[PDB]
Design a protein around this ligand. Structure first.
Ligand SMILES: O=C(Nc1ccc2[nH]cc(CCc3ccncc3)c2c1)c1cc(F)cc(N2CCOCC2)c1
Length: 351
């Protein structure tokens, strides 16, 4: 019942995969993993296979591996990445050292859509509706993406959209420094570590994405953390005392207060010619105080999506047990938990 595996070297990386996966071709790599495109002869699908890099090298990495697998096994929604397969060449826990994760091959992301074609208001409605529909689902499981951006959004030729995470490297300060798309979609509270963050950090990102779909241009293309903050506060206004009290960081709070006070701008004069309903929704998403931001579930009911909104086809997630997050284990323990989840994996209905 165990499939036969075959070996192949690709860019100095050994790939051992079941025979069903053919025509492996490098797509990308980083500190956390390497990715190949392939043809799944069992399902007839073009797939992307991610091989994790040293998944159990440390406690921190071992835990991250377990977390990703748990997440991936749980997410079953049209607008979210689906796990087609997870495998290891290991025949036992003792020799278990590699984990491979398989999903549908992307190809086009939202970045190349917005860079390479004209989008009507109808397109924007459909794209953002799908992101919000996925977010409702993940947020109902108390799962937060935190790194929503055009390159993490797969879009097909019928404009159908899926949320994933193509991060293959450590989320360091260097990667977040300077004039980088890495930071342009980030909620200010997480960019400047103001406070404990809520799931509406993802709604801020959606606002930034929606704005760029409407104008074709990045909303807050800051040259660094502080330049980006100034771009944000110019649009949305400097915070009042109510928000300032919620900023737990004394240093961050003290910095914001050094800034000259500015009013919220008129969004109709920024997003010129945009559907007034799109302008209205942007104003409800691009709110500095994360307590006051519209939720995904609230947003799906906004009049901007009247064309697509169907309350009987916007599903929530099954309960997701994240007790493991608070738990301290050894590498070998995280490894055994991970091994059990590989072994217990049941493929989605064919296909
Ligand atoms: O996308 C994720 N993982 C994943 C799994 C299997 C994969 N195979 C290949 C890749 C690289 C990306 C890719 C996919 C398809 N074609 C080309 C490249 C890969 C990645 C992923 C990881 C996470 F930790 C969270 C989320 N969540 C997503 C939902 O919102 C909550 C976070 C998604």
């Amino acid at each position: 019942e165990r499939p036969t595996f075959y070996r192949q070297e690709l860019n100095k990386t050994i790939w051992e995969v079941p025979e069903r996966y053919q025509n492996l071709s490098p797509v990308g790599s980083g500190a956390y993993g390497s990715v190949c495109a392939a043809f799944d002869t069992k399902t007839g699908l073009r797939v992307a296979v991610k091989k994790l890099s040293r998944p159990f090298q440390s406690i921190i990495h071992a835990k991250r591996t377990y977390r990703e697998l748990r997440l991936l096994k749980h997410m079953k929604h049209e607008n979210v990445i689906g796990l087609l397969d997870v495998f290891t060449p290991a025949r036992s826990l003792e020799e278990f050292n590699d984990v491979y994760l398989v999903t549908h091959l992307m190809g086009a992301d939202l970045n190349n859509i917005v860079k390479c074609q004209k989008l009507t208001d109808d397109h924007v409605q459909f794209l953002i509706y799908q992101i919000l529909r996925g977010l409702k689902y993940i947020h109902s499981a108390d799962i937060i993406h935190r790194d929503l951006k055009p390159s993490n959004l797969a879009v097909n030729e019928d404009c159908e959209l899926k949320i994933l995470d193509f991060g293959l490297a450590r989320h360091t300060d260097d990667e977040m420094t300077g004039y980088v798309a890495t930071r342009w979609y980030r909620a200010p509270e997480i960019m400047l570590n103001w406070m404990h963050y809520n799931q509406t950090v993802d709604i801020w990102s959606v606002g930034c994405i929606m704005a760029e779909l409407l104008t074709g241009r990045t909303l807050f293309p800051g040259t660094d953390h502080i330049d980006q903050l100034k771009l944000i506060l110019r649009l949305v206004g400097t915070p009042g005392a109510e928000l300032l009290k919620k900023i737990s960081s004394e240093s961050a709070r003290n910095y914001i207060q050094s800034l000259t006070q500015m009013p919220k701008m008129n969004f109709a004069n920024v997003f010129i010619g945009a559907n007034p309903l799109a302008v209205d929704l942007l104003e409800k998403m691009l709110v500095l105080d994360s307590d006051k931001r519209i939720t995904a579930a609230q947003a799906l009911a906004h009049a901007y999506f009247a064309q697509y909104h169907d309350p009987d086809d916007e599903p929530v997630a099954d309960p997701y047990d994240q007790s493991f997050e608070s738990r301290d284990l050894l590498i070998d323990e995280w490894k055994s938990l991970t091994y059990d989840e590989v072994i217990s994996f049941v493929p989605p209905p064919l296909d």
